[PDB]
DNA sequence: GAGCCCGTAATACAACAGATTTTTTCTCTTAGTTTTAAATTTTTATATTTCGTCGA
DNA sequence: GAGCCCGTAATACAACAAAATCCAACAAATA
DNA sequence: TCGACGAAATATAAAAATTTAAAACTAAGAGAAA
DNA sequence: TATTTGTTG
DNA sequence: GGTGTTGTATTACGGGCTC
DNA sequence: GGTGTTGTATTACGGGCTC
């Protein structure tokens, strides 16, 4: 740079002394050099890959003693173009291709001396973002899952965008004193200077006041009627809707277990809106490492792990459900837009299977296992294996089909086909949909399957499970509908 | 437990698995295809009394079967 | 300086500092239990496999 | 050399090294 | 040495009816190791 | 007078 | 692939004075 | 009155040679 002549009267060959052993007039009163050298050279080093006049020995010049002011002042001089910028940016510039053995002290040392030349006079006593103006939010209808925890609190960044989901283990006992404990218990990132969690008027923040007294931070839970312009009531109403999905889903090892894969599924997904996905948003770097290894269960030391291992790659999930919100297609092309289906591909079919009757408030949309193809009549009659071929229980018009049952990756569990599967398999469910009204056979969704299969259960075997919350929320989803 | 219980069977169910598929040399998707028919065997209230190498070469002809191959019923019982 | 051999001889560095049971999950190993399906008979028409024999 | 003030600023030195039961046995405290 | 036939082995769906494993499933028992 | 309970190699 | 690591009193080294 | 202390590899320093 400055010249391609380095001074040998410094450290720089005394380092490279190591093993090549050019010469020795270090210095004058050189007791810091020797020692120096021994210790860093000896002990760990053993690094400098000896060149004939050069100082490469890394990717960077090892600058001497005596040509580091010049470099410094050629480097920061505005007039010479250097800018006289700040500390942070002039040390990350100035070590792709410089050592400077103790660089940050003379740096500092450099700094401290020249600010007499250039004095800044910023102002030093008395505007958003970045957990200063935070919200959090409860959730309303909860199952007990296992333990009582029956409460979800999601905290929403206002600028971020980064959500949370915390506080489940009660929806009142956790409410009153243990909400600010819980505040306190995610309040390790830091303590925001104004919460506007807008839920309702409350004795809190009466003891919040007292733990920010207790500490110094001057923070503020006024929350006094709503921020509501345009938004974060979007925001909040497209929350709660993936969180009752969640609700809608994972009987057992609940939602209390996996939220935090939830949570970051979520803030790993690109906003779409406005800019990029909430990990880097406000942190800037780490990949999700979408890969999880669901294969190689041959392969497998543990096999429990390895099914957990697939249940986390549920991730498709979320993120369908979100792309599918984030909701709508082309009028009147719904007609058309069943299509030719090749014979091989399995096919669902609607209630009609055999017996067409009257479901019980149906929301199954489909209500039965899939089926394969073999041949076609027309446009408009498929031929599809259901029962034997008596009174014509082969056949249904296109409007009754439909065609994916697909993705096993997203989807681990197989289908359940005897009842002694179905005694084994009874205590893994997600959601129970309506008595069939023949005479009493229940309708129901397992866990780890597609919503679109459907699994028969009868009373035999629906005496070994909690039901209780089954058809609790049967009840209260009749109540809904009628 | 009871996944505890699950664990060591799967492994032994593993371990026989690959020993028979040492000898009748079989991709590795057919023999995780094999697992899981196994395991949903097991959930099946798996057959009791019967001996360990006629349900893992069902498990191992139906893998094989599964996708178009060549391993013909001989060749599972050459011992 | 500059190093080397070798023969003595100093030289900081660390062990003696009460020792043992528990505590909480996990992971092979090895013996006892439980549910369940399977070894020899009738049998009935069908069909293909594999011996087994016979013939000119 | 010779020392001093003062202001930074390096510098070996040790703590995290699982936690907690007693064992055997002196002498205080009642009842 | 190609043709000609006999014949047990299976499925098969029941009712059955004594013995034989037999492999999931518990449960000690040791051995780790912060 | 037996059963305790402080502290210490 | 896998194998120490910072908190802490304590102490050493440059600007400015006497030379 | 009463409060560290040696065993051990490891390494540093003189006679005798080359200078």
């Not at chain 2, 020993?19 to 094999?34: F, M, N, W």
Request: aromatic content about 10%; hydrophobic content about 35%.
């Amino acid at each position: 740079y400055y010249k391609s002549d380095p001074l040998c009267s410094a450290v720089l060959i005394h380092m490279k002394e190591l093993t090549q052993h050019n010469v020795t007039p270090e210095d004058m009163s050189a007791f810091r050099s020797y020692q120096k050298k021994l210790e860093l050279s000896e002990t760990f080093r053993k690094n400098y890959s000896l060149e004939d006049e050069m100082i490469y020995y890394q990717d960077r010049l090892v600058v001497p003693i005596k040509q580091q002011n010049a470099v410094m002042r050629l480097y920061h001089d505005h007039t010479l173009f250097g800018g006289h910028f700040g500390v942070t940016v002039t040390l990350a510039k100035i070590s792709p291709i410089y050592y400077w053995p103790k660089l940050q002290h003379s740096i500092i040392q450099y700094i401290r001396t020249c600010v007499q030349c250039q004095l800044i006079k910023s102002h030093r006593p008395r505007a958003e973002g970045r957990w200063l103006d935070i919200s959090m939010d409860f959730v309303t209808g909860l199952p007990p899952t296992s333990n009582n925890l029956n409460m979800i609190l999601v905290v929403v960044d206002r600028f971020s965008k980064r959500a949370h989901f915390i506080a489940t283990r009660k929806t009142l006992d956790a409410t009153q004193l243990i909400d600010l404990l819980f505040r306190y218990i995610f309040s390790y990132h830091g303590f925001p200077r104004t919460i506007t969690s807008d839920r309702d008027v409350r004795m809190t923040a009466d003891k919040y006041q007292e733990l920010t007294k207790r500490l110094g931070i001057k923070s503020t839970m006024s929350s006094a009627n709503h921020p509501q312009t345009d938004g974060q009531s979007e925001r909040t109403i497209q929350t709660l809707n993936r969180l009752l999905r969640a609700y809608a889903s994972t009987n057992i090892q609940n939602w209390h277990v996996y939220l935090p894969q939830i949570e970051f599924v979520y803030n790993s997904t690109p906003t779409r809106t406005l800019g990029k996905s909430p990990f880097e948003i406000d942190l800037g770097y780490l990949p999700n490492t979408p890969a999880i290894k669901s294969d190689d269960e041959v392969n497998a030391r543990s096999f429990t792990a390895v099914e957990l291992a697939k249940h986390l790659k549920a991730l498709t999930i979320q993120t369908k459900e979100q792309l599918e919100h984030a909701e709508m297609e082309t009028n009147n092309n719904q007609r058309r837009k069943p299509l030719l289906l090749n014979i091989g591909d399995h096919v669902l079919v609607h209630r009609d299977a055999y017996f067409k009757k009257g479901a019980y408030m149906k929301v199954q949309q489909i209500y039965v296992g899939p089926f394969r193809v073999v041949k076609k009549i027309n446009d408009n009659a498929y031929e599809l294996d259901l029962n034997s071929h008596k009174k014509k229980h082969r056949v249904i018009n296109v409007q009754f089909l439909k065609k994916f049952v697909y993705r096993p990756d997203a989807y681990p569990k197989n289908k359940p086909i005897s009842s002694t599967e179905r005694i084994k398999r009874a205590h893994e469910v997600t959601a129970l949909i309506g008595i069939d009204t023949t005479h009493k056979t229940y309708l129901c969704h397992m866990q780890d399957v597609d919503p679109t299969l459907s699994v028969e259960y009868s009373e035999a075997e629906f005496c070994q499970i909690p039901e209780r919350t089954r058809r609790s929320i049967l009840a209260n989803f009749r109540q809904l509908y009628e | 437990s009871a996944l505890e219980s699950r664990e060591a069977t799967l492994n032994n169910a593993r371990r026989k698995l690959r020993a028979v598929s040492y000898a009748l040399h079989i991709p590795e998707y057919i023999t995780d295809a094999a697992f899981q028919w196994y395991k949903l065997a097991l959930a099946n209230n798996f057959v009791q009394g019967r001996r360990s190498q006629n349900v893992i070469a069902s498990c191992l002809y139906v893998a094989c079967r599964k996708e178009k191959t060549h391993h013909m019923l001989i060749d599972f019982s050459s011992r």
